[PDB]
Amino acid sequence: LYDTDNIIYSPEGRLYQVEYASEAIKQGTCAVAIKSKDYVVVSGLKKCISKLSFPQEKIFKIDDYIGISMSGITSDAKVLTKFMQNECLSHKFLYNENINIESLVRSVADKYQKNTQKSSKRAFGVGLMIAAYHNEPCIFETRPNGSYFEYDALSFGARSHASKTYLEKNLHLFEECSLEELILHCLKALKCSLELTISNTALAVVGKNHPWQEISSLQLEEYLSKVK
Amino acid sequence: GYDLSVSTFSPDGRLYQVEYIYKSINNNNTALCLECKDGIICCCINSNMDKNKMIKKNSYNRIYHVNNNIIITYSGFDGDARNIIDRARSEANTYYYNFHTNIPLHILVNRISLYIHAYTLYWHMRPFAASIIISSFNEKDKGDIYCIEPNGACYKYSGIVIGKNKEMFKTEIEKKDYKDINVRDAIEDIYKFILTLQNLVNFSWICKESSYEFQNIHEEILTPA
Amino acid sequence: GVNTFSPEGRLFQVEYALGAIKLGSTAVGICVNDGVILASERRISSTLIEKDSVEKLLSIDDHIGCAMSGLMADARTLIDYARVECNHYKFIYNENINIKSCVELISELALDFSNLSIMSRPFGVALLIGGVDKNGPCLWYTEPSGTNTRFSAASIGSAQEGAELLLQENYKKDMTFEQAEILALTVLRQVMLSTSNVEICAIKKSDQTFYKYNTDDISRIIDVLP
Amino acid sequence: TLGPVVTGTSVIAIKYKHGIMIAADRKASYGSYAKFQNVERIFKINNKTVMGFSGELADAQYLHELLTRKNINNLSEKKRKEDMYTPQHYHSYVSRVFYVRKNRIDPLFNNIIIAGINSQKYDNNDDNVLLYTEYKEIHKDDLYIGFVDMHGTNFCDDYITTGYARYFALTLLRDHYKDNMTEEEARILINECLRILYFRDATSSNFIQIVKVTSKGVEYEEPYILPC
Amino acid sequence: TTTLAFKFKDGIIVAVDSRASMGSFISSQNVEKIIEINKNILGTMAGGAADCLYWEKYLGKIIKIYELRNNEKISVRAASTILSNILYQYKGYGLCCGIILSGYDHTGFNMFYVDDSGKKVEGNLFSCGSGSTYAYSILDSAYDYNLNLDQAVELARNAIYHATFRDGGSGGKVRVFHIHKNGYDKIIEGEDVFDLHYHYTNPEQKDQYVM
Amino acid sequence: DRHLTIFSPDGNLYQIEYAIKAVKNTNITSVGVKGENCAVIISQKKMATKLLDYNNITNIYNITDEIGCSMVGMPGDCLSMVYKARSEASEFLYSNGYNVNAETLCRNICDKIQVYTQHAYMRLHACSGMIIGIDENNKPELFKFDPSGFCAGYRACVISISVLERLLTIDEDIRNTTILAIEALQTILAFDLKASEIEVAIVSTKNRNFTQISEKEIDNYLTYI
Amino acid sequence: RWYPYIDNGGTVIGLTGKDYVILAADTRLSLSYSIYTRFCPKISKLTDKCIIGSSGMQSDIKTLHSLLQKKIQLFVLEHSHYPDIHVIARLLCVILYSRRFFPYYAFNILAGVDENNKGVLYNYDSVGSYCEATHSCVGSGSQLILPILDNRVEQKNQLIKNTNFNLGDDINFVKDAITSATERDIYTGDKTLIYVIDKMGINVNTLDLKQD
Amino acid sequence: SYDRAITVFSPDGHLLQVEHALEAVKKGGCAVAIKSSNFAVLAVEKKNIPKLQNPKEKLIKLDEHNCLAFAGLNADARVLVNKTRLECQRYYLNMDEPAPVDYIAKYVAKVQQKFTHRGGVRPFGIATLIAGFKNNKEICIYQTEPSGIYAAWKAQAIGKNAKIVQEFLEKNYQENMEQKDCIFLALKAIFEVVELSSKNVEVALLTEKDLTFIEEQEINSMVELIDQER
Amino acid sequence: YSFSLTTFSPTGKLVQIEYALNRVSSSSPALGIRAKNGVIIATEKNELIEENSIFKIQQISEHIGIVYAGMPGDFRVLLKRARKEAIRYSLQYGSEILVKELVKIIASIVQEFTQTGGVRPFGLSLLICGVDVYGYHLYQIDPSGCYFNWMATCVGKDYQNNMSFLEKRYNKDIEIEDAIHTAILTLKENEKNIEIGVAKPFKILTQNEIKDY
Numbered sequence A: 001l002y003d004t005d006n007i008i009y010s011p012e013g014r015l016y017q018v019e020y021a022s023e024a025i026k027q028g029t030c031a032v033a034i035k036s037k038d039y040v041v042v043s044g045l046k047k048c049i050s051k052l053s054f055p056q057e058k059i060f061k062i063d064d065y066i067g068i069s070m071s072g073i074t075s076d077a078k079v080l081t082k083f084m085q086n087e088c089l090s091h092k093f094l095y096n097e098n099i100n101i102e103s104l105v106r107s108v109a110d111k112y113q114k115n116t117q118k119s120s121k122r123a124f125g126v127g128l129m130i131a132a133y134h135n136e137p138c139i140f141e142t143r144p145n146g147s148y149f150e151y152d153a154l155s156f157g158a159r160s161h162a163s164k165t166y167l168e169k170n171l172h173l174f175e176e177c178s179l180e181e182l183i184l185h186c187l188k189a190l191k192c193s194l195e196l197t198i199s200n201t202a203l204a205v206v207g208k209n210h211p212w213q214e215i216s217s218l219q220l221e222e223y224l225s226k227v228k
Numbered sequence B: 001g002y003d004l005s006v007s008t009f010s011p012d013g014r015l016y017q018v019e020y021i022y023k024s025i026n027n028n029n030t031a032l033c034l035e036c037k038d039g040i041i042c043c044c045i046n047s048n049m050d051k052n053k054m055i056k057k058n059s060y061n062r063i064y065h066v067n068n069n070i071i072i073t074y075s076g077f078d079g080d081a082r083n084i085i086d087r088a089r090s091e092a093n094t095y096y097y098n099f100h101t102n103i104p105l106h107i108l109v110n111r112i113s114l115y116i117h118a119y120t121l122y123w124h125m126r127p128f129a130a131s132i133i134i135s136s137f138n139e140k141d142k143g144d145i146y147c148i149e150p151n152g153a154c155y156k157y158s159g160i161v162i163g164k165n166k167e168m169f170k171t172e173i174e175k176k177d178y179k180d181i182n183v184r185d186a187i188e189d190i191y192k193f194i195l196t197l198q199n200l201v202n203f204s205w206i207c208k209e210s211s212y213e214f215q216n217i218h219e220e221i222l223t224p225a
Numbered sequence C: 001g002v003n004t005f006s007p008e009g010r011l012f013q014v015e016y017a018l019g020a021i022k023l024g025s026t027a028v029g030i031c032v033n034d035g036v037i038l039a040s041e042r043r044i045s046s047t048l049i050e051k052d053s054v055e056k057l058l059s060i061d062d063h064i065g066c067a068m069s070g071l072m073a074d075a076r077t078l079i080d081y082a083r084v085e086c087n088h089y090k091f092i093y094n095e096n097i098n099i100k101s102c103v104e105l106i107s108e109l110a111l112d113f114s115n116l117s118i119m120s121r122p123f124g125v126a127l128l129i130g131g132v133d134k135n136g137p138c139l140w141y142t143e144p145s146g147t148n149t150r151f152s153a154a155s156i157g158s159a160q161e162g163a164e165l166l167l168q169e170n171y172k173k174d175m176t177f178e179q180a181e182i183l184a185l186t187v188l189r190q191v192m193l194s195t196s197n198v199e200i201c202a203i204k205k206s207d208q209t210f211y212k213y214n215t216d217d218i219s220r221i222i223d224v225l226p
Numbered sequence D: 001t002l003g004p005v006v007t008g009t010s011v012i013a014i015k016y017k018h019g020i021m022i023a024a025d026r027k028a029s030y031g032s033y034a035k036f037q038n039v040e041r042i043f044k045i046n047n048k049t050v051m052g053f054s055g056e057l058a059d060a061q062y063l064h065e066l067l068t069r070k071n072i073n074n075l076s077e078k079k080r081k082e083d084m085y086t087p088q089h090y091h092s093y094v095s096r097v098f099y100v101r102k103n104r105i106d107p108l109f110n111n112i113i114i115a116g117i118n119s120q121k122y123d124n125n126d127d128n129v130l131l132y133t134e135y136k137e138i139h140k141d142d143l144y145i146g147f148v149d150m151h152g153t154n155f156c157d158d159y160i161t162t163g164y165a166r167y168f169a170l171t172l173l174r175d176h177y178k179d180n181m182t183e184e185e186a187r188i189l190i191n192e193c194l195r196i197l198y199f200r201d202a203t204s205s206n207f208i209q210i211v212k213v214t215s216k217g218v219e220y221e222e223p224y225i226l227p228c
Numbered sequence E: 001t002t003t004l005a006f007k008f009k010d011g012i013i014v015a016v017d018s019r020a021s022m023g024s025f026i027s028s029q030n031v032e033k034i035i036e037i038n039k040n041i042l043g044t045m046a047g048g049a050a051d052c053l054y055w056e057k058y059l060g061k062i063i064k065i066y067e068l069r070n071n072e073k074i075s076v077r078a079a080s081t082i083l084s085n086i087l088y089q090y091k092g093y094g095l096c097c098g099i100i101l102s103g104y105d106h107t108g109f110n111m112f113y114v115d116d117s118g119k120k121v122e123g124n125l126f127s128c129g130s131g132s133t134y135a136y137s138i139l140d141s142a143y144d145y146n147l148n149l150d151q152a153v154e155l156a157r158n159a160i161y162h163a164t165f166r167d168g169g170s171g172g173k174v175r176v177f178h179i180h181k182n183g184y185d186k187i188i189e190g191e192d193v194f195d196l197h198y199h200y201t202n203p204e205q206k207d208q209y210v211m
Numbered sequence F: 001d002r003h004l005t006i007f008s009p010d011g012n013l014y015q016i017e018y019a020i021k022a023v024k025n026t027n028i029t030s031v032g033v034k035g036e037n038c039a040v041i042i043s044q045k046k047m048a049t050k051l052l053d054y055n056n057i058t059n060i061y062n063i064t065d066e067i068g069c070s071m072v073g074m075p076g077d078c079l080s081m082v083y084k085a086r087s088e089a090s091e092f093l094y095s096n097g098y099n100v101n102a103e104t105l106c107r108n109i110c111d112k113i114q115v116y117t118q119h120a121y122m123r124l125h126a127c128s129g130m131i132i133g134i135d136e137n138n139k140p141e142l143f144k145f146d147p148s149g150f151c152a153g154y155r156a157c158v159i160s161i162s163v164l165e166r167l168l169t170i171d172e173d174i175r176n177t178t179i180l181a182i183e184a185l186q187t188i189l190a191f192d193l194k195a196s197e198i199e200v201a202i203v204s205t206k207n208r209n210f211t212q213i214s215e216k217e218i219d220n221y222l223t224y225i
Numbered sequence G: 001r002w003y004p005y006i007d008n009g010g011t012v013i014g015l016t017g018k019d020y021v022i023l024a025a026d027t028r029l030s031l032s033y034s035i036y037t038r039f040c041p042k043i044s045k046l047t048d049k050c051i052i053g054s055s056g057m058q059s060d061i062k063t064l065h066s067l068l069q070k071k072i073q074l075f076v077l078e079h080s081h082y083p084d085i086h087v088i089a090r091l092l093c094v095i096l097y098s099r100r101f102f103p104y105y106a107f108n109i110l111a112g113v114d115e116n117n118k119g120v121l122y123n124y125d126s127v128g129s130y131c132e133a134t135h136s137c138v139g140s141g142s143q144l145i146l147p148i149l150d151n152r153v154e155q156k157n158q159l160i161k162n163t164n165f166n167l168g169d170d171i172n173f174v175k176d177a178i179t180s181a182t183e184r185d186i187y188t189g190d191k192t193l194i195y196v197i198d199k200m201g202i203n204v205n206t207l208d209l210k211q212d
Numbered sequence H: 001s002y003d004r005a006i007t008v009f010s011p012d013g014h015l016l017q018v019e020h021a022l023e024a025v026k027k028g029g030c031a032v033a034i035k036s037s038n039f040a041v042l043a044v045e046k047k048n049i050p051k052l053q054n055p056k057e058k059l060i061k062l063d064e065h066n067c068l069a070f071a072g073l074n075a076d077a078r079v080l081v082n083k084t085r086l087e088c089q090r091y092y093l094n095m096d097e098p099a100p101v102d103y104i105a106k107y108v109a110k111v112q113q114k115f116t117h118r119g120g121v122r123p124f125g126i127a128t129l130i131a132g133f134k135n136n137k138e139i140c141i142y143q144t145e146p147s148g149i150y151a152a153w154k155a156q157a158i159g160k161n162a163k164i165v166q167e168f169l170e171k172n173y174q175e176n177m178e179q180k181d182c183i184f185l186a187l188k189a190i191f192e193v194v195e196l197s198s199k200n201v202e203v204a205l206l207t208e209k210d211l212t213f214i215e216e217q218e219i220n221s222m223v224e225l226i227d228q229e230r
Numbered sequence I: 001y002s003f004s005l006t007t008f009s010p011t012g013k014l015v016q017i018e019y020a021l022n023r024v025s026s027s028s029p030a031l032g033i034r035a036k037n038g039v040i041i042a043t044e045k046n047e048l049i050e051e052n053s054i055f056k057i058q059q060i061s062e063h064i065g066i067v068y069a070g071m072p073g074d075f076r077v078l079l080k081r082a083r084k085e086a087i088r089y090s091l092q093y094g095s096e097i098l099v100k101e102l103v104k105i106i107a108s109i110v111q112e113f114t115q116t117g118g119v120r121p122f123g124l125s126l127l128i129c130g131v132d133v134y135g136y137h138l139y140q141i142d143p144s145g146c147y148f149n150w151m152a153t154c155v156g157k158d159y160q161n162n163m164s165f166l167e168k169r170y171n172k173d174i175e176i177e178d179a180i181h182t183a184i185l186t187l188k189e190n191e192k193n194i195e196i197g198v199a200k201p202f203k204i205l206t207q208n209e210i211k212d213y
Ligand SMILES: CCONC(=O)N1CCC[C@H](C(=O)N[C@@H](C)c2nc(-c3ccc(C#N)cc3)cs2)C1
Pocket: E020, E022, E025, E026, E027, E028, E031, E032, E049, G007, G055, G056, G057, G106, G107, G123, G124, G125, G129, G130, G131, G135, G136, G137, G138, G139, G140, G142, G143
């Protein structure tokens, strides 16, 4: 009775539809993101329903130094990806400088929570992991209930608790480690979530004097060999 | 079955959605504002996210400012609070559009309280889940502190606490009169009441040392307190 | 509520619309280096129906075709939208749309009912859209949930599972275009054969042009079954 | 505005060793009548950005109030010193405003100069921005002076003159200007340019306001009378 | 400009020049004026080049969408009607378009003339542009229905040559296309009118030609 | 189903009764009394239901210099009705160029309230109002309305009725009317009242402007009784 | 009344070989017998194998180039590949025709090297009419340069031919063309920028000209 | 319900309002369409109280060359027919050629799907049988369901007891046939469900020139022949 | 969100109209009597409330007056609308509005809320009295939106008994004074309770005038 519509607060003081949208995030595949003094690396699992199916794209570009990973409903993620891309390019057209990530994440969070007020609309059933280098590496989590948070390290999706435990164990080493060491730590966390075939793992990097770039297949194979 | 809509009075004459919003806000993080002789000291305790160790240290700040001399803090949901804060900023900007002067604090309080109240009328809008402390300090007028409840009310205080554990914090801060105490001598007592660690707290004030303008405590003043 | 969520995080209307796409005649699509082929079963309920009037296969563009299952009228609306948008792209840019981009447009219209940013309910159709672009041939599956999936080979309709198993058991990457043709006919034969029983279309890498099969082409691959 | 009535005269601006120096006389003419002779014509946008105008006063005041509220909007969304908008951002905003107004055949009857310091590395002024209450040698590439026109055409140079100074002072600047000029050399050069403008321009005045945008912020020198 | 279409025994001939002069200055003598609207209908540019190019391509996209929806090639009459209605919708805006749409459909060989002012006229011998009167003179003098393909081709080439010779705003090259049942052919893709003058009127080339 | 503002099978509208119950639940009392050439409203200065600023609490309001009012009920609804009354008076002055009457303002406010009464999609304002002002014939006017959207003029009113009935020079008339209002509130509440917890507001022919007497004058009047 | 159009002057020359494109343009900006500045570039980069130069009103040119760059970047983000010069050409035509009843006062040359490693130049008027060419010129000086290019490139009035064209000779020819433009055109002068695209990318050279 | 979803997916996967519209269509009177070489015949049942109701309309001439026969709700049929006539004339204005039967059948099916999909509207409780001529001068018949799906038919029946008349038409259609034989086939087909009488049916022959209604005397003679046969 | 709250019952009844009818039935009574040379409408009804500010009988125009039974606020908005429509007809055609046209317009407006989405019917019944070139007019408008043309009628509480009394007492050829006396007789089944309005222009009779009658 208290979860039939999204505008009704529960007697405890909870919005059940928004919490169901936040529960839809857990069904997505695992994604992990970590950073250091310089770089950010984001890794994820490309869903493959059958051997005839190609893997599903997991990471997307937003700007020259911004990229995203998603967990939840893919259409919502596509809508928000288009919104962020148009916002970044509109800032680049109106003014001749890069958009602030803080303003962009605030805009995306406002766009989320605008749908949680009108009874006609529904909350966004997708959680976002925005990785960027504006003046320094940065990772942002955005949840369906309108909130966003900075993160030193981050992970979420199906079976993400083990990777989060690995990050809780190894957070103190990421700041001083080199870029290849950081890539190995991210890949080890992604393995701990679970087999890391060339097809089923997406990985990308962004940092100082390094635009957003998916690591190639040969380099990815070399790094996956180095994981042991 | 009268509590399933904000636009219906129960047989007792009560709107239960407002009471449920009150319960939700009381379940959220604690926020204090206090009126000292040289300034007002405001702070927030983000202890609900103590379990989350992955958060970047001192990044989730519930303290915001308007026109560089009006602190505005909240207890409730983040998105609704950001709507209220952006509306307050827009109203201040409109007042400067028309009149070339900063908006008075109480007119902003009335306008934003009416804006919050406007959502508690229709059957197709979610009422705001946030209690808002808006405050300022002046050399002449001393500290004006206003608390806007989710029901559209707005009340002036000489000290206010909202969020979880508000009763204990209220009776603790009520013990001593702060109209003859400075902010530097008050931060120690605020930390003592927060104990009854330091990366889950936010602070701000508008005293003379900040030239009566918004600021946050530097780590070198945080630590010795 | 059309937009209401479930406690499991799944939208009720999308979950219900997924039940509609199972119902329908079976169709299959195979992609090889030489080209892409889509075969489809016809439902000739009685002799009074004109056979050529009902067409399960059709063109979204000169270089794109599709096999559709589910609620047919919704499919006619979707293909009309796709045709308009594809020709708009060809006007605005003077080239051919990628099949991924057309599939993404069709998926973007699919969940227009949600009104996140006008349709009122989800579509009840699933589409195997094949075609040749600068990246070669490809074949993309889309469903009411709004998710797209590039496939080497795929099937839709009532006998989805059996056709999928037969495709998985008897598909190779480097197989000849005629090899893929006999694969399509064998899969449809096992699911259910003569001219006008099945409709076949092909888009080749050499031509990049839609080509609906007819008499003496349907029978040619029927004559070389194992 | 349908055309100018109360018009402001030329503005001069140059780079020098410690920052920007911008000069304007404090006269606004009502046709051919010195109705006002104490008019502030150079506006402080923020601690490292100032604006000057030549044209109708009402349009300039409108643009100044627009940029002022843009500055408070920027300050409200501030977390660190690098979040502040540089003179490049304000110059692009003014250019877009003038272009959009030009599309409708309804311009702001003005020619605008936007000047200041781009980089934040020379001081920590914007750590605690205050609104209601030795120098450093700054590189030429970290300074900014930019012209914006009624038709929206805009550009940047080491020295910008707007108004009638484009003929009288621009010649002397193109002859005598040099890089790394001292404050005194810049002052005497600007004084000579304003002397020639006062002698040869009817609408000009010999009551000058100089503003310095340096490492210690914006500094309004007390107005003075040009000797002879 | 000079564009000149005309029906004849085996089909339709279309012929155009290739200039895009901006007032007195010649901007380019290599412009394609016979826009292929689709595989059977052919366009033709006169007047404003931007409007003709844009709206003929728009008619092309409209015809492609119609043919894909209904699965049958459109008629010359329907394309002419759509173009005329679209152009009449922009009455009072300053468009400048003179178009000759020729083609083959199930009704037969059909030719139409359309204008930016909503005109639509069905005929068998049309000409547009600044040099249209001269091409009309040559065509109406020499036109016959029972001409062969080569006879009609040389007639069209001669008419275009005379139009370019008299008219200051026409010249460059001449492009002559032939439309038949199964499509169309570019009989002359491009040919300088310099050689046309020194072949037709001044073959001796011993002195300057007196007009 | 009593949720909507629709007719019950007995013909009653229960949402208006529930809103009136909401107004009564605040336990806030205000007494309006007319005089020969003056009108008084005396209201009780307390929150609707230690560090709270008790000077800021008030039920009386200034719609205009001449007209004033006292609203009782929900606080957000009270402020919203105050802003509606000010907008109505301002619109009247703009269109007609002379000051609206208390009577006409009450008519228009209840016309606005009837829209919420009739429309199902609008919640009713839990607000009763008591407006006073002098008319153009130099006589007082005391009008009063409730959440039902029905207004009436009263010789005296409360938001007990018999207590006023038995009780019922310009300076002497003003003094007697103020004493009557204070004594009526004291007798209705049935406990001795301090001057710091009540608020008196007066309009009169001598001073046309709405104004509230200071606490010293209220103390003098209480010591007089 | 206020007339919402000015001519900022200057010139932009474009040439193509079998496997390369050269685009020269002056960097003078002028209101009317006056000089705003002595360095205002007219050529912009769109992709790693395409450039656009233009002459006319400078605000229109700058806004058009920024909008076209934004549209190409959105195209790359959406369609997962970089557009050819022909795709950008049709896009520019549509963008210019969108303002058909209040046009961009800008005449453009779109230079690039296509999929087939073939140099392509598309010249554009204000209202979107456009065509391919081997050589083109826009701006104040164009009526001077274009007869020279017609004489040298496609010699028609010459009975014996010499078509031994190479990159260095073409660069020298374009340098001579812009030099002759500077001599006989008041609005052409100051430095000039020459962009070259042959097989790998863009290479930029600069040349001082007469400062008068 | 100004903009609200009246038709939505059920737990099984059906759009329940569409089947309810089909149930409404099953109440409508029987209507039969038969094709021939260059002409068609449409025969539709009529029910009217004798001696009171004016006999004077289930068949319609849509434009110069099309014709329609519906089964279901009559007011919905009337508004759909008015929209169809408007679109016929709109096409003939926008193309300067008469609307083909295939185009207008597609438009009617599109409109029915649109009312099956838009918010704040109810599905059309009517099935339709259109008959007409194409651009290539061939004649054909299109049957359109309430669910937005259409299809071309050689011969078809809609309305109450449609299955019996359909399976009767299956065993008697013989490709090209004369006008007399076509009309007689239509009469004996539609009379397998409705009572054997002359006044319970109206039948019309569509030719390239115009749609001609068969006079009551011919129908009565053919009814007498049918009665003598059985 | 525009959906009709008033809906047909399974027995073909608009029960919301029935409940509004019940509400006006529970309200205090009013009545009207039409004479050969006049028309009268009268009412029935604290010691602190002012009698001047609560007049149920109101004037729409110079020869049209109105009385109601039901809700006060609904009556005030309908009175404002009636005055606006009368002013609209006077501004358009010049002459003062006819009683029948005003009654038809108000009846249409009252019926509109019976069908418009998201609103309820008016909770009152009106009685218009007036004079024009076609004589004297008395018209009753229900919550349903139906206008009834009467010689004399009663509305509100105990209206059946009052109708029986008036039907026994009423005659067609009565005078203004006899009609006023019969109205007071019907209302009897004090001075301050009754208020009377008679339509020469429409007027409200002061308290002494009812006192002498
Ligand atoms: C402020 C602008 O400075 N003034 C300028 O730039 N001018 C004026 C003088 C002649 C110049 C000229 O003609 N330049 C040649 C290379 C051009 N040709 C075209 C063109 C476009 C489309 C078609 C077609 N179909 C044909 C030609 C566009 S430019 C263009």
